[PDB]
Design a protein around this nucleic acid. Sequence first.
RNA 1: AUCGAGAGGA
Lengths: 180, 160, 43, 65, 133, 114, 86, 264, 773, 196
Amino acid sequence: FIVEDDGHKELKVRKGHIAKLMATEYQDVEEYTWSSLLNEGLVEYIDAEEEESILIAMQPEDLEPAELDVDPAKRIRVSHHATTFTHCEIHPSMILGVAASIIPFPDHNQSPRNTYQSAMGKQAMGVFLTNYNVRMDTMANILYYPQKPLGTTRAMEYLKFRELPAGQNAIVAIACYSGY
Amino acid sequence: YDRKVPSPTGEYVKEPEWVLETDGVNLSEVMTVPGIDPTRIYTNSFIDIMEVLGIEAGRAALYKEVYNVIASDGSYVNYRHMALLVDVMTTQGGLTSVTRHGFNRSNTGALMRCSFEETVEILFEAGASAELDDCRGVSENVILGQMAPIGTGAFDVMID
Amino acid sequence: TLSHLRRTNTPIAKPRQLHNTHWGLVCPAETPEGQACGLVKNL
Amino acid sequence: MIVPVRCFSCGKVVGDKWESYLNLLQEDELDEGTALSRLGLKRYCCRRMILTHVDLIEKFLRYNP
Amino acid sequence: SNTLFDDIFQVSEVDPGRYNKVCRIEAASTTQDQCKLTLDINVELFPVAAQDSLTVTIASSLTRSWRPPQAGDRSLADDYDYVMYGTAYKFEEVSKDLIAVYYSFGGLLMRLEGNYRNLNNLKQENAYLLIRR
Amino acid sequence: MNAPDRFELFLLGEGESKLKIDPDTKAPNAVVITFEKEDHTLGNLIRAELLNDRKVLFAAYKVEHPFFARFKLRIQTTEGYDPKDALKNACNSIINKLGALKTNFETEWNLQTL
Amino acid sequence: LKEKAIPKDQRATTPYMTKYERARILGTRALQISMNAPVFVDLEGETDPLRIAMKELAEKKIPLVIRRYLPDGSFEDWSVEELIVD
Amino acid sequence: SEEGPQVKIREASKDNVDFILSNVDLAMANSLRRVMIAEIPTLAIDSVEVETNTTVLADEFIAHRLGLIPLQSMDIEQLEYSRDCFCEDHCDKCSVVLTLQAFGESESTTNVYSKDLVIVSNLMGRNIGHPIIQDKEGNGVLICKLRKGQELKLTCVAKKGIAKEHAKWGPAAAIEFEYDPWNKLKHTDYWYEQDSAKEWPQSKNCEYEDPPNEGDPFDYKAQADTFYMNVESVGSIPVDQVVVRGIDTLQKKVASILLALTQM
Amino acid sequence: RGNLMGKRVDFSARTVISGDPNLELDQVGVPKSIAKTLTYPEVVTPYNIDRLTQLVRNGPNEHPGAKYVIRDSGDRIDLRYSKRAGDIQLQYGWKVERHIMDNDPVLFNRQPSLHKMSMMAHRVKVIPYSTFRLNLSVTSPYNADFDGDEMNLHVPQSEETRAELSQLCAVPLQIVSPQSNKPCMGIVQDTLCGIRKLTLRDTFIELDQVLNMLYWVPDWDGVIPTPAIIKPKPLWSGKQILSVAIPNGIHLQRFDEGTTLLSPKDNGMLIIDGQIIFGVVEKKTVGSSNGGLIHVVTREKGPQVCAKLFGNIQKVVNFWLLHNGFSTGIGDTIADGPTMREITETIAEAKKKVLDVTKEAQANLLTAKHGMTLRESFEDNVVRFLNEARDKAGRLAEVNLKDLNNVKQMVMAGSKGSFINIAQMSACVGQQSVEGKRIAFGFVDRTLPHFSKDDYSPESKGFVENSYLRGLTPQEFFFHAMGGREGLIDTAVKTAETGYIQRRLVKALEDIMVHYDNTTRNSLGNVIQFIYGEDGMDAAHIEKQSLDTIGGSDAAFEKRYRVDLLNTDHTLDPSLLESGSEILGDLKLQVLLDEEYKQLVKDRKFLREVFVDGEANWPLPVNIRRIIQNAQQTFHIDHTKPSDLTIKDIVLGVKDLQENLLVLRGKNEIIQNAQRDAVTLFCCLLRSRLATRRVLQEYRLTKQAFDWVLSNIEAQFLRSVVHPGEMVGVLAAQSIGEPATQMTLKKVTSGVPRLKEILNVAKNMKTPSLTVY
Amino acid sequence: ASRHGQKGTIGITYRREDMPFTAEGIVPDLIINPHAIPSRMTVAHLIECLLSKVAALSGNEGDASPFTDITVEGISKLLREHGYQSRGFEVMYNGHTGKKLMAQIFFGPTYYQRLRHMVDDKIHARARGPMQVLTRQPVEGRSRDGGLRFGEMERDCMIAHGAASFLKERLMEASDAFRVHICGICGLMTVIAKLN
RNA sequence: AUCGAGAGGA
Ligand SMILES: [Mg+2]
Ligand SMILES: [Zn+2]
Ligand SMILES: [Zn+2]
Ligand SMILES: [Zn+2]
């Protein structure tokens, strides 16, 4: 996203653009596409070298003014103390890869665990293609009764995980029982 | 360093003392200095002590370094094991390293040493020098597929 | 399949560990273990 | 790939509940929770069979052979 | 095969510790003001509260199995109401003419201090304990 | 590929008898019975009802390995009480309890209205 | 190299039977047993050659001799009857 | 009424019976629960001879499904175990031969329900093997779907069995089983961070037991006798005959024990 | 090194492992397919012919069976396809390759095989699934899990081979490990957590569960132990039932930091004649620790009794736990509100300390501590504060956790868990590190593009205030990623470096065998040591015991050992001897006692000259601390009757006992001086324990018990002697290679890099230093 | 394996009776050890259980994205309002006896996957069979009924025990034995031997 | 089958 002066520091995107975007997403009028955002200067393409010369906010809620009551169980995010902004991140959950986007709450585990799961999820049995019955590959393994998880990362919607899931919601009990 | 010392009563007590740690090492000149106790100095480099304080002191410094790296993890291994390793590294004049340079170039048979490094050049030089292997070592009697001189085969068995 | 389609390789001075520049362009978690850990990254 | 006959943990007949399920939220505009309760699915061991189930056969049929 | 000890203790200190089914009790003999004891008491079985008066007795009988009380033909040896069975594990001698005995009823400990059980308590595993309300 | 045929859990085979008796060693009046193709279902019930009997010194069961469908029960009794009689009487108490239960239940269900 | 023996009166090696020589002895006995050799004990109803060897050893009825070897080339000869077992 | 285990029934239906078992030892109630689950015989399919399969699924997929369909087995006792009978592979007094034949004529997807199972073997007049259909629309359980031109043709030989050999014979659904809800017996240490009262909820049956007051100490020689049960059925056997035949089955187990003792 | 030093072999098998408690220690659950495959040649004899003939007749396709039959001509007979499968009649001298059967000895091995104790014999138990089952207490010397791990099983092919396996490489003999001179196998996770909650003061057991528990222990006599409660209800203690597996005659004395004989915290541990008296059971007692229950039982009762001790504790505790239950949940990660507020107030105080230091150092008002620069003083002052805050918050959490928090109970048991785990999951995960320092500046003068440049704040260099429970922020998550990556790579590097190090070790010392003259040598005849371990003793049969003559004041030493037969109040009181008043005066004995005391003071000065640091607890062969207990309980000593010992008895008996603790046996003064030197520590210990006053006053021995002590001590000394033939080079190389694999990361090279600077003589050491006094 | 690096084999399969169960008559599909929790610090597993149970009861989808402001305390509020315990424990009864489990147990639905390693795809054993042409040794690979490598690491192992006869059997009687005739003058394998 | 390259497993 692009932050500029309107008034004061504010991102260039706005709720009307989201209106037109999701209204195009429903027709599924002059459709509002990703290219319509890019060719409108509401979004830029920053590579590794370029981000050395800009100051990026992480969430748009970093752009409200600040001047109490709070959930102590909520996480402790620091006041950002920065106002020379130029951009705001899209969403930090998008720094992840394709395989680390399946784990729920990856912000609550030890990073080695998440890497181990990243490497193991490529092993799981499931439906790899709806046309397994036509393709005669050398090794095919399909799960009889796949299920979509009850805990979903939002990014599954674009990874089609809830359309081709590869696991089951086992009823887990964490118990000591007969020592097997 | 709160060193333990006996009181005149016989009861041990911790006597605190001031100690100096260095960021460099040069033994030859530091101990030959007034004001210090040249009987208690210690260097974390054993290879300088081997040159300065004879060979047995280097042996002991090496053993202490090994015990330190084992005690770092809280582990404990028994003195006979590290002692065998150390006194092997010291059963020659100086520190016989455990690399291809060191013990490896010994005359410990010929089919023994052809199983660590320079696997071919060792056979070459042993055909050249016309080495004779005792074939008493483990690896020789293993390569021969014979019963090796091990605990079970340290002897012979005859009839009455 | 989707991971394999987005997979990199580095041939071979500390090129393995994660770097501040990897933010947003490479997964910090997704990478093989043991041999060539950190060489093969997934964007 | 298709609706299970019985739940995996209790054993109740849950197959007959599938065709109804959709039409409870697609015709009667219900909610998944109430459209599961009105079907006699109360213990979550049965609930998760109809809720998490992905009917992939609708795509398997698209193929002609 | 008969009783080895009798006395009357009034408790002084009650301490639940960290447990929930047991309490450490530090009690003192009444009008015999030199013998004092400490005891682990199952509160759920005998709810001993603070500042109580409890009669303490020690027996030596009344190997083979322990059959449960079969019938009334098995006559009990207890008008008391709380009975335990353990073993001695040390006899401490705090001062001259002041001995201490150490009993353990499978975890539940007891220490007794004084010098007037002298002829009775031995280093024998056999030691029954009896408590009257 | 090595797993048993399932029906082995409840059907005997090749001279495997249903009950085997062995007098216990280092025990006065006692026996250990090898049951065959029975599980906790019967064992714990028989043990509880045996513990209801007031002439039995000792009674307990165990499954030495869950792979196998078997369970052993040991009983030690008073004098003059061949422990098989205690087992018999406990089992008959069980059967009569179950019969009274079934009868009361049919009664109440017929009383029930649905 | 000529007659590197040691007379019995003057010997210094360990008089106990170490687990290595004992294991080799039991193994040699089990070998020759398993191939139908006679047995030197009224065997208390046992068939396994290894346990036959263990009982024979406990009964001091094995006619085998250990030639404990040294570095110099000389050696020692020890009887199973000599060698104590603990 | 009769002497011993008293039963007070609370609710009853063709689906589930919720009641109270009273004046029994615990082990008897546990054994009854286990035998109600997985020791009363029913009937379901144990062989599937397939002729033509053009479905989008595999043959053993549909087989595994077919085994799981609940079948009416009220009069199951007139049918003998296939291993017990003398027939060659299966007969009419020892098995039931359902069959199934479907074809996707319609341009629309043709479902293959349970009611499409046609019985073939002779019943000899007994309530046996009727596919249980409790749906409110008449349709059975959904087995497979068919596109245009995809036919299915198989026969099913259903034999007698119990849930130990495989769970398809499971005639009991889920047995609610609670006792001492106030936990006056101290059979469980309640985990707590503020108060064992506010965090765990009041059990449903807590109204049927007399509340304990904090003054009365603990009843140290009470043993559990009152239990609160609920049996749910799938449809092969009504809830009543489930528990009835389970009690009869446990008594039969003890009877086999006694006759083995006689043989001894 | 690919086809000669090691090669693929027949008669092998390999598959997945799994844990099954109802197997004893030295059993292996072997699948039925494997046992149908693997063969063992057996010779037909009138002991076996009736069984082997039936075995043949059973055919090769069901176990027990046989596959091949060899006659004296040598033409193999294929029972799988032949005419005479049932007609066969075996004449003698033949071989049958039977299926591997129950109680067969087979080698069980785990790659990577580092330890000598990772290739152990095992007894076959043929099970109906396709996994290798084994006991959970054997996961230590294999470093196994059941998380996909698979292992290998080799079969012997000769009777002497079966002997070598069953008498040398068997499991029960490998309980005691020469490395670390302590047992390797112990009580593991599930059994341990059970044995804790079983043994609490509070945990009481009713009747039916007690009788089942009793029956569970196989080697049980039927003596239903009397309960600890009698009147209201006959309840038992978990100790009173647990004691039934601990054999008769095992004593154990331990104290834990608060251990009055009242044990106000149930600390320590008392075990009397094989019956536990008081004290919680946890890893310090039953673990793989030094001087624990496995150690004592292995030394005293033997290997088989210890294996059955494993079996019995397991079968009891798993049963109890199975019926009592255990869970983890997240409720064990939530501390109280006020605790969490204190936690974040501590973190805020730390942040303000750091900010004060920062704005200070920005005014150049920094006393740059000597040796290090400005920025280094700042980095130290900040990292110290952040780690202090993390550990203080973690300690607050561990203070607030209740007694029933399940993670706290796995911590107390020692099964699985630590404290820093608690600090991270609930309090504060802390500050991560890459290449030693804080989160480096990847971009120009900043860590991530979301911060101003030159932001040395705690929040910018990697500090993570939010615990795992609250939730990491994006920046913090990425810094944790940077830390965990270095963790993974350091692990993968140090593993291989250790592997090559250990291969060099083994191939350096591979021929070092204790020859028959107790002189450690190699293939060339070179001598490494003239006495093995400088004391000629095995690493096993060694226990850590105290040299009691050292330490303590001089006057207390005099009170503890000095006897003045010529004094009124420094002589053996007649309460301690029949010969009390008779011995008064009698200078002919006071000379002997004076010589005793002179030798003891000589040894005191000797030890204080050797162990300068004043540590008396040191490893020695024979544990007298336990033998004295064996005596006091075996002959039923009462501390009331006088001894029947002359002082000459004690003194001359000790003095000639020393003369029999042989190590080397030679007949000459050089070997004799070697032996006299090589037992001097043990003889110092002996006199420190077998002192006349100490003997007759601290353990009132009789004559019978005394001579029994003096024979059993000789016996244990001659058994603890190292055995000629032990290949000690491989043993030592492994003893030093394995515990190195478990090392990882105040500026010195510590751990494996220090090791590789040490082994390969490194003239460019990365951190030399010169500690001078 | 779960979705948080929790690997695991199947120790044994229990029937439905033997299994523990709650008051509602619900029975676990999976029983995992508690001890594997704190040494790995997998809090996503424990939280996921809660979220999955809450969504299964309510009939919604459990948003499990990272950097979302989801408290465990709101999940606990929801599970309390749904008539369950707040932190997700549930009273369970032993299946063998029915005696209340003194320890209430963490119980809930949770996603699990089947990794591609089945034992019938891993098991292997060899007694005797095909042998390489050149090395006269057991071949490598299960697909050829291959042999297992008694590698030199395992040889270093076996040496410490003292079993020399075991090594001689493993190296010759188990594989690639060979009988060679040699001459006393020329100490090579060049002599000629017509046996018959 | 021989050689070599890959992705995986503990
Ligand atoms: Mg593993
Ligand atoms: Zn269900
Ligand atoms: Zn028939
Ligand atoms: Zn020649």
